[PDB]
C-alpha cells in the first residue's frame, strides 16, 4: 500500500509542521520545504523546472505549477502545514519580492495546505558592499 | 533661470551628504535629493488574502498576516519616469504637504 | 474541475479594459454553498443591475478600479 | 386560445429555469407568443430592446447573412420552420424546448480580454453577461450551420436542425457551437 | 516511484527546556545509522528556529518573539534541546520604527553563574508626552547625551541582573515583560521611553551540560 517514510505517529488532531523557504526574484521563484531545522530538505521546485521558456521562469503560472507539485509531495509525507519564510534576492539587490511571490503563496493554500506563521526574511545589510550597477546605474 | 530655490535637495548647513543607490536603477543619488517614500503594503492580493486566511493554522491571528515594509529611494530620472513624482505648474511646484 | 455558482449584480461600478470593452460590477452570490457573499467582478458584454452571471470561481476577485 | 408557434407548437410547454435567462429570452410573454416569427419590430432603437424580441425572430435575423442573402426574411422563416419540423421528427418534443434548451446550453460564460492596468498587458479572466451569452449562442449555432451546409447537399434547415439538437445535447463533437464554447471557456480558464 | 528518497529517514520529536512547554513542538528528520554514522550523533549540533508556539497558555499573542534552541541530547527517539537564542520578527520591528523620535539601541555582554556568556541587544524609543500627533512639527528627539546615559543605565542593570541568575531564570525573565517594566523605571529620569524591547540575544560561550544540569533543565511539571 502506502509507505510514507514521513513521521511515525500522527492523528487527525495533530499538526505536522514543515517549513517553506520561498524565494522570489524578478527572474525566478523557489519553493523549498524542509524540517524545522532547515537541515533536511524535503521538496524542491523552481519555476524553470515547470516551463521551457527562460522568460516565464518567474511567472505566476510557473509558481502555481511549482506549488501544486510541492503540496502533492508533502501530502504523501503527511504534512498539513507549512511555516512560510519569504525572501527576495535581497542584500545589495532589490528587496521587493518577485511576481511569483503572491501566486506561490496562494497556490500553496489553494491546494489545501494549512499555513503557519509567516515571516519575511530578506537579507538586510546594516551596511552594504557596493551595488552591481554603474555609478549611474542601468542606463536605458 | 534658477528653477528651484531648494535646487531639489533638502540640504542646508553642510557641505556634503551621503549618497544612496536608487531602488529602481541603482544610480547614486543624494540622500537629500532622493525621492523617498516609505511603503507599508500587504504581501498579498485581497482575494489571495481570503484564500490564505481560510487556511491559517493559528486562529489566534487578528490581522495575523505581516505587512511588507519598504523604504523606497528613487533617483530623479527613475521617480519621474516611474510616475512616483510628476511635472507640475510653477505655482504648485512649491507645495509641500499635498497628499489626500 | 466543474463547480458553478449563480451570481447576481447589485451595482454597475466602472468601465474598464484597454479598448474599454469590459464592465466592472458588484455581485451577491446565490449558490447555497456560499450565500449573500459579495464579490467584485469584471464582466464582458452588456450588463444591467440585477442580471445573473455564471461564475466558475468565487475565489478570483477582480482588482477594483481607480 | 393560446397561439401555437407555426400553429403546431405550444409555448406553454417551454419553461426556463436558469435565473439569468428568464429576463433575457422572449417566449414567456403574451407579446412573445406569435404564430409567425416575423414582427417587423423596432427592437434596436434602445439598449436592451433586443430582449423583447421573440427568440425565433432573433435566430431568423442571424440567418439572413451574407451579401447575397441580406434582407431576404421569408427564406429564413421557411428554413427555421422546416428545421423545427425535422427537429420534432427526430426528438419528438417541442422544437422550441429544444431550441431554447440549446441557446441556454451553448454559449460562453468565461471569456478572456486585454485589461490594461498601468504596465500590465496580458489576457485576463472575464465573465460573460446574459445578453451577450444569448447573442453569442445564436451567432455560433448559425455560423456552424453555414460552414457545414456550404457546398454540401444538406440544406440549411437540415444543418441547423442537426446543430440545434447537438447544441442542447452538449455534444462537443457534433456541435460547432459547443466546440467554440468549450474552446473559449478553456482559453479563459488558462488565462486566470 | 522507485525507492522513496526518505527510505532511510528516522524522525525525532523536539523537546523544549524549562521555561517552555514540555510538549513536543516540532519534528525533525535524520538519516538512519550506517554503522559508521550514529543516528543520534548526527543531530548533536542542530538549531531550531521557533516562535513562542512553545508556551501553551501565553503563546497566541507573541508571534513576535523568535527563540533558537539547540539539541543537547537525544533520548529515545525524541531530541531534547537547550537554550540557543532570542529574537524578533521583521514585522514586530519595522512595526515599532517611526520617524520623528530617537531610536536608542543598547548592546551588553554578560555572564551567567550557569557558565554561559550572552550578548543582549536592547531597543528603545523616545516617548512623546506633549499630546499631539508626532510629526514633522511634533519632533520628539532626545539629546545624544541622554541617549548615552540611557545606554549606560540599561546596560549596567542587565549585567547585574545577569550575574545573579541562572540561564533558565535569565531566559524566562528575558522573554517576558519584567525587564521592560524595570528598564522604563530606571530610564524615565533621563527620558520617557516607549516600547522597550530585547531585540536579540546571542549565546557567545556555552558550557557542556552534565547529566545533572540537563536533568534539572528538564524538570517539567
Ligand atoms: Mg544588473
Ligand atoms: Mg561640494
Ligand atoms: Mg520640542
Ligand atoms: Zn534610478
XYZ file of C-alpha atoms and ligand atoms in Angstrom:
723
model
C 0.000 0.000 0.000
C 1.225 3.429 1.025
C 4.545 3.511 2.817
C 5.106 7.125 3.744
C 8.614 7.492 5.066
C 7.412 10.624 6.806
C 6.692 10.762 10.581
C 5.712 7.577 12.503
C 2.826 8.676 14.727
C 0.120 11.160 13.813
C -3.553 11.822 14.456
C -6.322 13.788 12.789
C -5.946 16.416 15.510
C -2.203 16.598 15.025
C -0.415 19.230 13.041
C 2.635 18.192 11.051
C 4.828 21.213 10.534
C 7.174 21.645 7.609
C 8.866 24.919 6.699
C 8.674 26.583 3.293
C 11.505 28.832 2.173
C 10.184 30.804 -0.790
C 12.477 32.931 -2.913
C 11.031 35.357 -5.425
C 13.319 37.033 -7.941
C 12.400 39.090 -10.970
C 13.986 36.167 -12.807
C 12.575 33.078 -10.972
C 10.798 31.523 -7.988
C 11.838 28.871 -5.443
C 9.506 26.773 -3.285
C 11.590 24.724 -0.885
C 10.327 22.744 2.113
C 12.465 21.436 4.954
C 12.077 20.465 8.585
C 12.033 22.970 11.447
C 15.830 22.843 11.489
C 16.257 23.676 7.821
C 18.844 20.901 7.595
C 16.955 18.072 5.961
C 15.357 19.136 2.687
C 12.027 17.596 1.695
C 10.825 19.144 -1.592
C 12.385 21.467 -4.155
C 10.665 23.294 -7.012
C 11.815 26.135 -9.275
C 9.805 27.930 -11.937
C 12.333 26.897 -14.570
C 11.507 23.266 -13.789
C 7.913 23.979 -14.767
C 8.423 25.963 -18.019
C 10.763 25.710 -21.022
C 10.909 29.468 -21.726
C 13.694 31.411 -19.975
C 11.414 34.413 -19.531
C 8.487 32.529 -17.965
C 10.717 31.238 -15.148
C 9.402 33.787 -12.635
C 5.735 33.926 -13.728
C 2.635 33.077 -11.601
C 1.719 30.123 -13.874
C 5.128 28.629 -13.092
C 4.823 29.463 -9.390
C 1.436 27.731 -9.350
C 2.609 24.531 -11.004
C 5.631 24.531 -8.686
C 3.395 24.958 -5.657
C 0.988 22.155 -6.536
C 3.935 19.794 -7.114
C 5.285 20.665 -3.650
C 1.887 20.217 -1.989
C 1.216 16.894 -3.707
C 4.589 15.715 -2.425
C 4.132 16.927 1.194
C 0.711 15.271 1.216
C 2.335 11.851 0.994
C 4.886 12.833 3.638
C 1.852 13.536 5.833
C 2.425 17.296 6.179
C -0.581 19.540 6.878
C 1.027 22.854 7.440
C 3.993 24.863 6.326
C 5.507 27.818 8.072
C 6.447 30.417 5.475
C 9.712 32.303 5.151
C 9.603 34.686 2.207
C 12.644 36.183 0.550
C 13.644 38.403 -2.353
C 17.231 38.313 -3.616
C 17.992 40.988 -1.032
C 21.331 42.094 0.331
C 22.572 44.773 -2.021
C 19.974 43.797 -4.623
C 16.248 44.629 -4.660
C 14.150 43.881 -1.552
C 10.813 43.699 -3.419
C 9.825 40.042 -3.790
C 9.210 38.969 -7.382
C 5.916 38.309 -9.198
C 5.836 34.632 -8.236
C 5.715 35.506 -4.534
C 1.988 36.032 -4.102
C 0.973 33.403 -6.662
C 3.001 30.656 -4.994
C 1.830 31.615 -1.503
C -1.785 31.441 -2.709
C -1.481 28.265 -4.786
C 0.026 26.576 -1.734
C -3.103 27.135 0.385
C -5.327 26.826 -2.689
C -4.073 23.238 -2.725
C -5.466 22.502 0.724
C -2.280 23.079 2.675
C -2.617 24.666 6.119
C -0.473 27.744 6.691
C 1.533 28.509 9.826
C 3.427 31.613 10.919
C 4.604 33.961 8.173
C 7.834 35.950 8.163
C 9.744 37.930 5.587
C 13.379 37.112 5.786
C 15.045 39.125 3.120
C 18.758 39.706 3.631
C 19.141 43.227 5.065
C 22.540 44.973 5.121
C 23.310 47.011 8.236
C 25.587 48.224 5.620
C 26.367 47.334 2.137
C 29.139 46.479 -0.184
C 28.763 48.453 -3.397
C 25.923 47.751 -5.855
C 26.286 45.955 -9.188
C 25.087 48.977 -11.155
C 27.310 51.708 -12.542
C 27.845 54.888 -10.594
C 24.949 55.918 -12.817
C 23.046 52.616 -12.596
C 21.391 50.918 -15.556
C 21.011 53.425 -18.366
C 18.068 52.562 -20.683
C 16.928 80.919 -14.557
C 17.221 79.263 -11.176
C 14.311 76.788 -11.343
C 14.080 75.722 -7.714
C 15.178 77.751 -4.699
C 15.628 74.409 -2.978
C 17.624 73.320 -6.021
C 15.923 69.981 -5.421
C 17.833 68.767 -2.347
C 16.709 69.440 1.238
C 20.308 70.017 2.364
C 21.494 73.211 4.070
C 24.133 73.973 6.760
C 26.553 71.363 5.399
C 28.976 70.696 2.552
C 28.281 67.042 1.866
C 25.512 64.459 2.195
C 25.637 60.673 1.913
C 24.806 59.093 -1.438
C 22.190 56.356 -1.812
C 21.744 53.841 -4.647
C 18.346 54.163 -6.377
C 15.969 51.229 -5.824
C 14.949 51.104 -9.487
C 18.296 51.620 -11.265
C 20.913 51.795 -8.508
C 22.283 55.109 -9.600
C 23.921 57.031 -6.814
C 21.742 59.921 -5.703
C 21.994 62.450 -2.878
C 20.082 61.414 0.228
C 18.502 64.875 0.334
C 17.672 64.842 -3.365
C 16.281 61.287 -3.405
C 12.566 60.791 -3.738
C 11.975 58.620 -0.721
C 8.663 57.012 0.075
C 8.110 54.563 2.902
C 5.717 51.799 1.858
C 3.725 49.522 4.102
C 1.861 47.190 1.785
C 0.483 43.711 2.229
C 2.259 40.733 0.691
C -0.969 39.508 -0.858
C -3.872 40.412 -3.227
C -7.121 40.785 -1.208
C -8.619 37.726 -2.967
C -5.462 35.795 -2.149
C -5.967 37.125 1.381
C -9.355 35.417 1.639
C -7.853 32.166 0.383
C -4.996 32.228 2.923
C -6.997 33.436 5.949
C -9.130 30.356 5.421
C -6.088 28.122 5.810
C -4.322 29.877 8.683
C -3.443 27.216 11.246
C -3.383 29.535 14.234
C -6.830 31.029 14.780
C -5.346 33.410 17.300
C -4.321 35.712 14.484
C -6.118 39.057 14.367
C -4.672 40.557 11.205
C -2.088 37.837 11.770
C -0.520 38.205 8.359
C 2.542 40.531 8.320
C 2.787 43.709 6.285
C 5.701 44.339 3.918
C 7.838 47.318 4.895
C 9.820 49.058 2.177
C 11.899 52.187 2.377
C 11.917 53.113 -1.287
C 14.527 55.541 -2.617
C 14.368 56.878 -6.152
C 16.862 58.758 -8.245
C 15.114 61.573 -10.108
C 15.118 60.141 -13.661
C 13.543 56.998 -12.220
C 10.917 58.635 -9.965
C 9.847 60.874 -12.849
C 9.713 58.118 -15.480
C 8.012 55.826 -12.976
C 5.456 58.498 -12.100
C 6.151 58.443 -8.343
C 6.527 62.191 -8.856
C 5.237 64.217 -11.780
C 5.573 67.533 -13.538
C 3.668 70.430 -12.002
C 2.995 74.066 -12.832
C 5.280 76.769 -11.436
C 2.936 77.849 -8.645
C 2.080 74.341 -7.390
C 5.759 73.462 -7.707
C 6.401 74.757 -4.172
C 3.538 72.916 -2.457
C 4.865 70.919 0.480
C 2.336 68.659 2.262
C -0.115 67.635 -0.601
C -1.490 64.060 -0.367
C -5.241 63.455 0.249
C -12.893 20.825 -12.136
C -16.527 21.692 -12.774
C -18.254 23.606 -9.999
C -20.518 26.579 -10.628
C -22.287 29.439 -8.813
C -25.053 31.837 -9.874
C -24.069 35.456 -9.301
C -26.434 38.427 -9.306
C -25.293 42.008 -9.957
C -26.141 44.600 -7.294
C -24.255 47.571 -8.738
C -22.582 48.501 -12.008
C -19.400 50.192 -10.853
C -16.858 51.119 -13.521
C -15.978 50.591 -17.160
C -12.619 49.054 -17.986
C -10.262 47.324 -20.400
C -7.572 48.505 -22.780
C -10.151 49.162 -25.504
C -12.728 49.758 -22.771
C -14.666 46.604 -23.583
C -15.374 45.359 -20.065
C -17.651 46.430 -17.198
C -16.806 46.308 -13.500
C -19.565 45.024 -11.248
C -20.510 44.271 -7.627
C -22.095 40.869 -7.015
C -24.132 38.930 -4.447
C -23.879 35.147 -4.726
C -26.657 32.640 -4.982
C -25.304 29.098 -4.914
C -26.363 27.988 -1.474
C -22.834 26.847 -0.696
C -21.886 30.495 -0.350
C -24.913 32.759 0.013
C -25.053 36.535 0.352
C -21.298 36.704 -0.111
C -20.250 39.740 -2.091
C -17.639 39.991 -4.808
C -16.276 42.372 -7.410
C -16.106 41.001 -10.942
C -15.107 42.073 -14.429
C -17.775 41.220 -16.994
C -17.515 41.274 -20.775
C -20.701 42.099 -22.666
C -23.545 44.470 -21.794
C -24.949 44.270 -18.261
C -27.688 45.885 -16.191
C -28.221 45.838 -12.466
C -29.733 42.578 -11.251
C -28.591 40.262 -14.004
C -27.397 36.772 -13.225
C -23.899 35.638 -14.125
C -22.408 32.188 -14.306
C -19.275 32.086 -12.199
C -16.704 29.274 -12.264
C -14.625 30.578 -9.314
C -15.899 32.600 -6.376
C -12.259 32.917 -5.306
C -10.997 35.041 -8.198
C -11.996 38.589 -7.282
C -11.264 41.405 -9.712
C -8.931 44.292 -8.944
C -11.032 47.389 -8.288
C -10.692 50.472 -10.482
C -9.036 53.774 -9.606
C -56.966 30.283 -27.469
C -53.220 30.169 -26.840
C -51.422 30.652 -30.151
C -49.024 27.869 -31.074
C -45.850 28.731 -32.989
C -46.453 27.946 -36.673
C -49.734 26.679 -35.243
C -48.204 23.341 -34.289
C -46.008 24.310 -31.312
C -47.202 25.218 -27.849
C -45.278 27.900 -25.973
C -46.847 26.831 -22.663
C -44.590 23.773 -22.631
C -41.428 25.887 -22.600
C -40.198 26.761 -19.116
C -36.867 28.459 -18.484
C -35.030 27.595 -15.272
C -31.630 29.299 -15.001
C -32.499 32.703 -13.413
C -30.160 34.649 -15.710
C -32.110 33.788 -18.856
C -35.728 34.326 -17.734
C -35.491 38.060 -18.379
C -33.313 37.577 -21.478
C -35.277 35.058 -23.590
C -38.594 36.223 -25.042
C -41.067 33.347 -25.169
C -42.612 33.758 -21.708
C -44.785 36.761 -22.633
C -48.221 37.152 -24.232
C -46.337 39.509 -26.536
C -43.827 36.788 -27.452
C -46.318 34.060 -28.340
C -46.508 34.520 -32.088
C -47.807 32.293 -34.853
C -45.282 33.939 -37.165
C -41.655 34.776 -36.175
C -41.997 37.998 -38.227
C -42.698 41.085 -36.066
C -41.213 43.916 -38.143
C -40.164 45.195 -34.733
C -38.255 48.294 -33.586
C -36.040 46.153 -31.353
C -32.893 48.216 -31.982
C -33.803 51.826 -31.013
C -32.671 51.494 -27.358
C -30.012 49.478 -25.485
C -31.951 46.437 -24.185
C -34.980 46.438 -26.575
C -33.444 43.418 -28.337
C -34.533 41.365 -25.317
C -38.237 41.899 -26.021
C -37.806 40.381 -29.494
C -39.031 36.792 -29.997
C -36.089 34.369 -29.898
C -37.042 32.643 -33.138
C -37.172 36.031 -34.868
C -33.715 36.636 -33.399
C -32.429 33.392 -34.909
C -34.057 34.314 -38.211
C -32.208 37.619 -38.009
C -28.875 35.840 -37.631
C -29.718 33.581 -40.630
C -30.180 36.366 -43.144
C -26.454 36.629 -43.711
C -24.088 37.087 -46.367
C -24.196 39.666 -49.155
C -26.460 37.544 -51.355
C -28.956 36.616 -48.619
C -29.148 40.023 -46.965
C -32.693 41.164 -46.362
C -34.425 38.006 -47.531
C -36.504 37.166 -44.471
C -39.142 34.861 -45.966
C -36.377 32.441 -46.899
C -35.205 32.215 -43.295
C -38.725 31.892 -41.868
C -39.071 28.882 -44.177
C -35.686 27.464 -43.188
C -36.460 27.817 -39.490
C -39.935 26.258 -39.635
C -38.574 23.350 -41.701
C -35.632 22.781 -39.350
C -38.132 22.821 -36.497
C -40.190 20.139 -38.275
C -37.110 17.939 -38.746
C -36.393 18.559 -35.052
C -39.814 17.294 -33.957
C -39.271 14.352 -36.306
C -36.007 13.480 -34.559
C -36.629 14.228 -30.861
C -40.413 14.376 -30.836
C -40.733 17.207 -28.325
C -41.457 20.894 -28.826
C -38.794 22.090 -31.271
C -38.956 25.243 -29.151
C -37.971 23.338 -25.983
C -35.017 22.021 -27.985
C -34.124 25.462 -29.368
C -34.384 27.370 -26.071
C -32.665 24.412 -24.437
C -29.810 24.759 -26.936
C -29.499 28.536 -26.644
C -29.194 28.132 -22.893
C -26.862 25.137 -23.049
C -24.402 26.543 -25.572
C -22.658 29.889 -25.226
C -19.669 31.163 -23.271
C -19.606 32.209 -19.616
C -15.932 32.903 -19.165
C -14.099 34.810 -21.910
C -10.670 36.464 -21.880
C -9.829 40.093 -22.614
C -6.985 42.583 -22.530
C -7.359 44.824 -19.482
C -4.636 47.440 -19.386
C -3.718 48.393 -15.848
C -0.618 50.571 -15.765
C 2.073 48.225 -17.035
C 0.043 45.014 -17.127
C -0.889 43.832 -20.607
C -1.818 40.176 -20.934
C -5.126 38.347 -21.223
C -7.392 38.375 -18.166
C -10.260 36.171 -16.987
C -13.623 37.834 -17.524
C -17.273 36.736 -17.126
C -19.908 36.971 -19.890
C -23.185 38.899 -19.474
C -26.555 37.190 -20.040
C -27.397 39.195 -23.173
C -24.032 38.511 -24.770
C -24.313 34.865 -23.718
C -27.564 34.540 -25.704
C -26.381 36.621 -28.684
C -23.199 34.571 -28.975
C -25.173 31.332 -28.634
C -27.220 32.151 -31.720
C -24.251 33.610 -33.676
C -22.270 30.415 -33.165
C -25.068 27.960 -33.899
C -25.774 29.613 -37.218
C -22.108 30.054 -38.203
C -21.641 26.316 -37.781
C -24.754 25.903 -39.923
C -23.251 27.940 -42.783
C -19.770 26.404 -42.660
C -21.275 22.921 -42.914
C -24.098 23.479 -45.404
C -21.932 25.483 -47.795
C -21.045 23.091 -50.628
C -22.836 20.019 -49.250
C -26.199 18.585 -50.270
C -27.516 19.070 -46.734
C -29.771 22.123 -46.690
C -29.720 24.897 -44.110
C -32.867 23.585 -42.439
C -31.085 20.268 -42.008
C -27.697 21.666 -40.894
C -29.425 23.982 -38.460
C -31.583 21.188 -37.016
C -28.523 18.959 -36.585
C -26.812 21.838 -34.830
C -29.725 22.711 -32.521
C -30.068 19.122 -31.328
C -26.318 18.638 -30.791
C -26.267 22.042 -29.089
C -28.807 21.001 -26.482
C -27.214 17.541 -26.143
C -23.929 19.280 -25.227
C -22.141 17.188 -27.862
C -18.650 18.657 -28.241
C -18.037 16.602 -31.361
C -21.241 17.166 -33.339
C -21.944 20.762 -32.210
C -19.835 23.622 -33.582
C -21.474 25.991 -31.101
C -20.198 23.833 -28.245
C -16.808 23.343 -29.959
C -16.271 27.098 -29.805
C -17.935 27.425 -26.376
C -15.590 24.876 -24.793
C -12.589 26.272 -26.677
C -13.335 29.790 -25.367
C -14.019 28.637 -21.815
C -10.698 26.778 -21.914
C -8.770 29.773 -23.251
C -10.391 31.636 -20.362
C -9.591 29.103 -17.633
C -5.995 29.109 -18.843
C -5.795 32.903 -18.657
C -6.684 33.426 -14.980
C 8.133 5.923 -7.895
C 11.182 3.777 -7.215
C 12.703 3.881 -3.707
C 11.282 6.928 -1.895
C 14.360 9.102 -1.037
C 13.263 9.258 2.611
C 13.517 5.436 2.863
C 16.347 5.707 5.387
C 14.937 8.509 7.498
C 14.177 8.381 11.259
C 12.031 11.113 12.891
C 12.562 12.828 16.247
C 10.290 14.993 18.397
C 11.748 18.258 19.675
C 11.538 18.879 23.428
C 11.681 22.411 24.875
C 13.677 23.483 28.006
C 12.446 24.674 31.417
C 10.825 27.997 30.526
C 8.709 26.389 27.782
C 6.074 23.674 27.299
C 7.261 20.102 27.832
C 5.028 19.006 24.967
C 6.898 18.458 21.730
C 6.629 21.371 19.336
C 8.064 20.167 16.039
C 9.632 17.114 14.468
C 12.920 16.600 12.637
C 14.288 14.211 10.031
C 17.609 12.352 10.045
C 19.260 9.523 8.109
C 19.452 6.055 9.695
C 22.682 4.773 11.297
C 25.166 3.401 8.749
C 27.436 1.554 11.196
C 29.796 4.487 10.908
C 27.188 7.214 11.141
C 25.496 7.073 14.516
C 21.937 8.361 14.089
C 21.716 10.230 17.394
C 25.122 11.879 16.936
C 24.433 13.478 13.551
C 21.949 15.712 15.431
C 24.226 16.939 18.265
C 24.515 20.479 16.902
C 21.229 21.305 15.167
C 19.395 24.598 15.577
C 15.636 25.174 15.821
C 14.005 28.497 14.948
C 10.559 28.786 16.512
C 8.070 31.365 17.789
C 6.509 31.053 21.071
C 4.346 28.337 19.715
C 6.175 26.906 22.700
C 4.328 28.210 25.784
C 0.864 26.713 25.716
C -1.123 29.302 27.673
C 0.763 32.504 26.823
C 1.718 31.775 23.195
C -1.008 33.107 20.960
C -0.204 36.821 21.129
C 3.557 36.532 20.877
C 4.395 35.559 17.347
C 6.853 38.375 17.709
C 9.467 36.537 19.740
C 11.729 34.094 17.918
C 13.573 31.527 20.022
C 16.537 29.495 18.830
C 17.044 26.144 20.529
C 19.967 23.734 20.165
C 19.827 19.980 20.684
C 21.944 18.934 23.634
C 20.579 15.424 23.853
C 18.808 12.547 22.186
C 16.645 10.426 24.440
C 14.720 7.557 22.957
C 13.570 8.856 19.582
C 12.980 12.363 20.933
C 15.533 15.158 20.903
C 15.997 17.389 23.927
C 17.069 20.988 23.337
C 18.811 23.682 25.406
C 18.673 27.483 25.076
C 20.322 28.913 21.993
C 18.974 32.352 21.130
C 16.260 35.015 21.313
C 14.985 37.284 18.510
C 12.252 39.259 16.728
C 10.140 39.143 13.541
C 10.738 41.805 10.884
C 7.145 42.819 11.482
C 7.451 43.476 15.210
C 10.499 45.623 14.423
C 9.523 47.819 11.472
C 6.231 47.948 13.366
C 7.957 49.994 16.032
C 10.117 52.208 13.824
C 8.754 55.720 13.486
C 10.120 58.961 12.085
C 10.372 61.947 14.461
C 11.653 60.230 17.557
C 15.047 58.922 18.573
C 15.957 55.277 18.111
C 18.071 54.067 21.029
C 19.977 50.790 20.853
C 21.935 49.158 23.690
C 24.331 46.188 23.463
C 25.641 44.263 26.503
C 27.902 41.287 27.257
C 27.189 39.206 30.359
C 27.991 36.023 32.269
C 25.557 33.700 33.991
C 26.566 31.812 37.110
C 25.351 28.909 34.952
C 28.583 29.349 32.995
C 27.094 30.989 29.894
C 28.335 34.076 28.042
C 25.474 36.026 26.455
C 25.182 39.155 24.306
C 21.973 41.145 24.720
C 20.808 43.796 22.303
C 18.134 46.140 23.633
C 15.948 48.511 21.681
C 14.071 51.570 22.871
C 12.171 54.553 21.521
C 11.526 58.135 22.519
C 8.154 58.549 24.172
C 6.222 61.675 23.278
C 4.363 63.255 26.179
C 3.191 66.608 24.840
C -0.109 65.273 23.447
C -0.230 65.909 19.748
C 0.289 63.506 16.881
C 4.038 63.022 16.451
C 5.050 64.632 13.177
C 7.408 66.941 11.301
C 6.127 69.616 13.720
C 5.822 67.356 16.781
C 9.522 66.446 16.908
C 10.349 64.087 19.792
C 14.178 63.733 19.813
C 16.179 63.153 22.982
C 19.643 64.695 23.340
C 22.562 62.421 22.390
C 23.910 62.742 25.932
C 20.611 61.500 27.375
C 20.867 58.568 24.961
C 24.348 57.805 26.305
C 23.186 57.910 29.941
C 20.291 55.628 28.935
C 22.685 53.084 27.418
C 24.968 53.177 30.432
C 21.997 52.584 32.743
C 20.202 49.823 30.771
C 23.495 48.025 30.129
C 24.582 48.181 33.761
C 21.259 46.905 35.056
C 21.301 43.964 32.649
C 24.831 42.883 33.562
C 23.778 42.953 37.240
C 20.531 41.010 36.738
C 22.570 38.585 34.621
C 25.377 37.717 37.036
C 22.934 36.743 39.797
C 20.732 34.377 37.769
C 20.902 31.018 36.019
C 20.238 30.831 32.286
C 16.837 29.267 32.970
C 15.966 32.254 35.147
C 17.539 34.769 32.819
C 15.810 33.488 29.691
C 12.412 33.278 31.415
C 12.740 36.903 32.581
C 14.073 37.949 29.165
C 11.226 36.590 27.061
C 8.569 38.158 29.248
C 7.691 41.718 30.198
C 9.552 42.042 33.549
C 12.717 43.700 32.264
C 10.751 46.151 30.142
C 8.933 47.406 33.277
C 12.156 47.731 35.261
C 14.049 49.370 32.364
C 11.344 52.011 31.951
C 11.600 52.721 35.673
C 15.372 53.215 35.540
C 15.293 55.147 32.283
C 12.432 57.575 32.967
C 14.573 60.213 34.757
C 16.815 60.627 31.733
C 13.920 60.428 29.300
C 10.490 58.800 28.896
C 10.775 55.732 26.668
C 8.291 53.702 24.639
C 8.233 50.013 23.677
C 11.456 48.873 25.249
C 12.330 45.588 23.603
C 15.005 42.936 23.733
C 15.917 42.942 20.055
C 18.111 39.881 20.117
C 20.085 37.553 22.342
C 23.151 35.639 21.217
C 24.932 32.908 23.100
C 28.639 33.548 22.873
C 30.015 30.768 25.067
C 28.019 27.788 26.297
C 29.374 25.130 28.682
C 28.590 21.435 28.106
C 25.777 20.144 30.285
C 26.410 17.462 32.883
C 23.689 14.806 33.037
C 22.656 16.559 36.251
C 22.049 20.082 34.927
C 20.448 18.726 31.761
C 18.103 16.795 34.041
C 17.441 19.942 36.092
C 16.706 21.863 32.923
C 14.069 19.281 32.140
C 12.280 19.306 35.459
C 8.833 19.724 33.878
C 5.693 19.951 35.982
Mg 22.405 44.427 -13.278
Mg 30.706 70.485 -2.517
Mg 10.296 70.184 21.482
Zn 17.019 55.345 -10.717
